[PDB]
Amino acid sequence: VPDYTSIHIX
Amino acid sequence: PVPDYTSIHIX
Amino acid sequence: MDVFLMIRRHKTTIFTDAKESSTVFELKRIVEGILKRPPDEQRLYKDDQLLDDGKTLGECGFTSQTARPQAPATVGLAFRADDTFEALCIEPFSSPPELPDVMK
Amino acid sequence: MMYVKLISSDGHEFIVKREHALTSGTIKAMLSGPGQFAENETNEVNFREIPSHVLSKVCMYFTYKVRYTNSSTEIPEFPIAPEIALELLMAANFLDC
Amino acid sequence: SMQAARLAKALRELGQTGWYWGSMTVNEAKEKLKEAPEGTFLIRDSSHSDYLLTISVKTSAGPTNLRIEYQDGKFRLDSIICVKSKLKQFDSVVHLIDYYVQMCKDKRGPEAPRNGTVHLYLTKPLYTSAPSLQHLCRLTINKCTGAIWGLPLPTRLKDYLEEYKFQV
Ligand SMILES: [Co+2]
Helix, strand or coil, X not given: CCCCCXXXXX | CCCCEXXXXXX | CEEEEEEEEECEEEEEEEECCXXXXXXXXHHHXXXXXXXXXXXXXXXXXXXXXXXXXXXXXXXXXXXXXXXXXXXXXXXXXXXXECCXXXXXXXXXXXXXXXXX | CCEEEEECCXXXXXXXXXXXXXXXXXXXXXXXCCCCCCCCCCCEEECCCCCHHXXXXXXXXXXXXXXXXCCCCCCCCCCCCHHHHHHHHHHHHHHCC | CCHHHHHHHHHHHHHHHCCECCCCCHHHHHHHCCCCCCCCEEEEECCCCCCCEEEEEEECCEEEEEEEEEECCEEEECXXXXXXXXXXXXXXXXXXXXXXXXXXXXXXXXXXXXXXXXXCCCCCECCCCCCCHHHHHHHHHHCCCCCHHHCXXXXXXXXXXXXXXXXX
16 A cells, blocks of 8 residues: 655665 | 664665 | 375365375374274375375375475375275365455 | 364364364363263364364364474465455354464 | 553564564574575564664565664654654554555565665565464455455454454
């Protein structure tokens, strides 16, 4: 349901 | 390789 | 290494396990200790194919990937009465009702 | 004995290991409960409202739960088809497992 | 409801998941997720003093750890830079994981990046123990529909389904 988001991990 | 502990960054 | 099986005959189903390297005859000994009938009065099947005592369970097609605990493989069981064997018969399970409208 | 017989509502007889059947709390209270020492005891449990297709699935959970309890093996998924999920939910709640 | 009751319910839901490992060091999490597919995750106790929960995830470059912040009655992921409105926060920590697993159902195989800053990915958990058959049926039902109050079930069981509406 929620829109995809590009999540970076640093 | 990835670090043992990381935090997220939304992009 | 361990394989998980459903030995079925008529309305009887046995949930048991064995080693993939163990043989069909050793599986008939496990049945002998449960249904009280000797191995020479037993016939084991995988679908329509009859299994022979010499082959191992892995050679018959029962591996760790096709005989898992959450999905055991079915082994047919036919008994001998007097001179001739009985025909393989497995009573099917019941049928679940059709899904509700909101489900799927 | 090592094995116990579980009979479904439609007469199907499932023979499973006693230690596996004790995963159900209801069955454990029945086999390991009160009784009479001198009287004969039946090694069969009858379920009048659990069908064979549901009871066979419950037994697979008994094998699944005991196999992956106190073990280092990675626990795989337990496939539950939606067409039996509600019947299975009612039986699981009744058997306390 | 007050803050302590919300947190107690969130911790109860954590214990019902089956992928909460409690005490677990960083290396033990690296061993269990060394050969696991990308997206396999688990929640364990945080060895840090200012945190309570930590996610161990198998990413493109191996297993890592994400600390879960708990501020003002809501659970959040540790972030290096954030805008408060743009960071998801929920009273239930299982709701937080279920939120990102659902979002990452449309994540990009060949179309995925191959080298650079690693992208987060969550799919299936790594169970430490087999959950109850009831809970497994609850997950299957939840993954099938969200309108549980029309199902042919006794009202007692409908309350059980309402206690855990997540798909993971
Ligand atoms: Co990128």
